[PDB]
Amino acid sequence: MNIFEMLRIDEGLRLKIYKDTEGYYTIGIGHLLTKSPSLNAAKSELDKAIGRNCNGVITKDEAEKLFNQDVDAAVRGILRNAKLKPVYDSLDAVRRCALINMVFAMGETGVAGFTNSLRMLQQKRWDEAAVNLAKSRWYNQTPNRAKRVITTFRTGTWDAYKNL
């Protein structure tokens, strides 16, 4: 298992504009277009992100191009971030994927807000961090995916992804 397969599990793939859990205009593999209410705003973001008139629809190839960008931006973001970087450098490879998954889902800013959990992760306090992370709006809104991520952090194994 790798980060792309892991995110493909958690995000799904939709070749047409769709509304996210949160109510937002999203496309392909978890690619947020706009937080705004207009399906037209979303269709515009969409043509600009692709470079063609899409009319709400993309090909696999395109969704995967988008996804390559996203993951890439997620990892460079972490590495550039002063809170994030040191946590990342301190973790083993699987746990790294887990931080990357979160950052991808809720942006750098959101993640770095998890001040206490980040500190436990850095201290390698696995169980404690798992509990702290569960006490979030994120956990409450998308319990099954948040649980898979937390498990990934608690264990350092791909277990949570091995039934999917």
Side-chain angles (χ1 to χ4, degrees), residues 17 25 33-34 38-49 52-57:
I17 292 159
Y25 279 110
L33 299 153
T34 183
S38 176
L39 172 80
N40 275 327
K43 268 133 109 112
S44 149
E45 268 322 285
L46 173 62
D47 290 341
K48 145 161 96 93
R52 82 180 181 48
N53 267 71
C54 297
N55 201 197
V57 165

Coordinates of all heavy atoms in Angstrom, one line a residue, residues 17 25 33-34 38-49 52-57:
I17 N -18.9 16.5 -11.2 CA -19.0 17.4 -10.0 C -19.9 16.7 -9.0 O -20.9 16.1 -9.4 CB -19.4 18.9 -10.3 CG1 -18.2 19.5 -11.0 CG2 -19.7 19.6 -9.0 CD1 -18.6 20.8 -11.7
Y25 N -18.4 21.6 -3.5 CA -18.2 21.3 -4.9 C -16.8 20.7 -5.1 O -15.9 21.3 -4.8 CB -18.6 22.5 -5.8 CG -20.1 22.7 -6.1 CD1 -20.8 23.7 -5.6 CD2 -20.7 21.7 -6.9 CE1 -22.2 23.8 -5.8 CE2 -22.1 21.8 -7.1 CZ -22.8 22.8 -6.6 OH -24.2 22.9 -6.8
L33 N -13.3 22.0 -5.5 CA -13.3 23.1 -6.4 C -13.6 24.4 -5.7 O -12.8 25.3 -5.8 CB -14.3 22.8 -7.6 CG -13.9 21.6 -8.4 CD1 -15.1 20.9 -9.1 CD2 -12.7 21.9 -9.3
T34 N -14.7 24.5 -5.1 CA -15.1 25.8 -4.4 C -15.9 25.5 -3.2 O -16.6 24.4 -3.2 CB -15.8 26.8 -5.3 OG1 -16.1 28.0 -4.6 CG2 -17.1 26.2 -5.9
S38 N -22.3 28.3 -5.8 CA -22.7 28.2 -7.2 C -22.2 27.1 -8.0 O -21.0 27.0 -8.2 CB -22.6 29.6 -7.8 OG -22.9 29.5 -9.2
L39 N -23.1 26.2 -8.5 CA -22.6 25.2 -9.4 C -21.9 25.8 -10.6 O -21.2 25.2 -11.3 CB -23.7 24.2 -9.9 CG -23.3 23.2 -11.0 CD1 -22.6 22.0 -10.4 CD2 -24.5 22.7 -11.8
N40 N -22.2 27.1 -10.8 CA -21.5 27.7 -11.9 C -20.1 28.2 -11.5 O -19.2 28.1 -12.3 CB -22.3 28.9 -12.6 CG -23.3 28.5 -13.7 OD1 -23.2 27.5 -14.5 ND2 -24.3 29.3 -13.8
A41 N -20.0 28.7 -10.3 CA -18.7 29.0 -9.8 C -17.8 27.7 -9.9 O -16.9 27.6 -10.8 CB -18.7 29.6 -8.4
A42 N -18.2 26.6 -9.3 CA -17.6 25.3 -9.4 C -17.4 24.9 -10.9 O -16.3 24.4 -11.3 CB -18.5 24.2 -8.8
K43 N -18.3 25.1 -11.8 CA -18.0 24.7 -13.2 C -16.8 25.6 -13.8 O -16.2 25.2 -14.8 CB -19.1 24.7 -14.2 CG -19.8 23.4 -14.4 CD -21.3 23.7 -14.4 CE -22.0 23.6 -15.7 NZ -22.9 22.5 -15.7
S44 N -16.7 26.8 -13.2 CA -15.6 27.6 -13.8 C -14.2 27.3 -13.3 O -13.2 27.2 -14.0 CB -16.0 29.1 -13.7 OG -14.9 29.9 -13.6
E45 N -14.2 26.9 -12.0 CA -13.0 26.5 -11.3 C -12.5 25.3 -12.0 O -11.3 25.1 -12.4 CB -13.5 26.1 -9.9 CG -13.5 27.3 -8.9 CD -12.3 28.2 -9.1 OE1 -11.2 27.9 -8.8 OE2 -12.6 29.3 -9.6
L46 N -13.5 24.5 -12.3 CA -13.2 23.3 -13.0 C -12.6 23.5 -14.4 O -11.6 22.7 -14.8 CB -14.4 22.3 -13.0 CG -14.1 21.1 -13.9 CD1 -12.9 20.4 -13.4 CD2 -15.3 20.2 -13.9
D47 N -13.0 24.4 -15.2 CA -12.4 24.5 -16.5 C -11.0 25.1 -16.4 O -10.1 24.8 -17.2 CB -13.3 25.4 -17.5 CG -14.6 24.8 -17.9 OD1 -14.8 23.6 -17.9 OD2 -15.4 25.6 -18.4
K48 N -10.8 26.0 -15.5 CA -9.6 26.7 -15.2 C -8.6 25.6 -14.7 O -7.5 25.5 -15.1 CB -10.0 27.8 -14.3 CG -8.9 28.1 -13.2 CD -9.1 29.4 -12.6 CE -10.0 29.3 -11.4 NZ -9.0 29.2 -10.3
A49 N -9.0 24.8 -13.7 CA -8.1 23.7 -13.2 C -7.7 22.8 -14.4 O -6.6 22.2 -14.3 CB -8.8 22.9 -12.1
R52 N -9.7 23.3 -20.2 CA -10.6 23.1 -21.2 C -12.0 23.2 -20.6 O -12.2 23.2 -19.4 CB -10.4 21.7 -21.8 CG -10.9 20.5 -21.1 CD -10.6 19.2 -21.9 NE -11.0 17.9 -21.4 CZ -12.3 17.7 -20.9 NH1 -13.2 18.7 -21.0 NH2 -12.6 16.6 -20.4
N53 N -13.0 23.4 -21.5 CA -14.4 23.4 -21.2 C -14.9 22.1 -20.8 O -14.9 21.2 -21.7 CB -15.2 23.8 -22.5 CG -15.4 25.3 -22.4 OD1 -14.4 26.0 -22.7 ND2 -16.6 25.7 -21.9
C54 N -15.2 21.8 -19.6 CA -15.5 20.5 -19.1 C -17.0 20.2 -18.9 O -17.4 19.1 -18.9 CB -14.8 20.1 -17.8 SG -13.0 20.1 -18.1
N55 N -17.7 21.3 -18.7 CA -19.1 21.2 -18.4 C -19.4 20.2 -17.3 O -20.4 19.5 -17.3 CB -19.8 20.7 -19.7 CG -21.3 21.0 -19.8 OD1 -21.9 20.4 -20.6 ND2 -21.8 21.9 -18.9
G56 N -18.5 20.1 -16.3 CA -18.7 19.3 -15.1 C -18.2 17.8 -15.3 O -18.4 16.9 -14.5
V57 N -17.5 17.6 -16.4 CA -17.1 16.3 -16.5 C -15.7 16.1 -16.9 O -15.3 16.8 -17.9 CB -18.1 15.6 -17.5 CG1 -17.5 14.3 -18.0 CG2 -19.5 15.5 -16.9

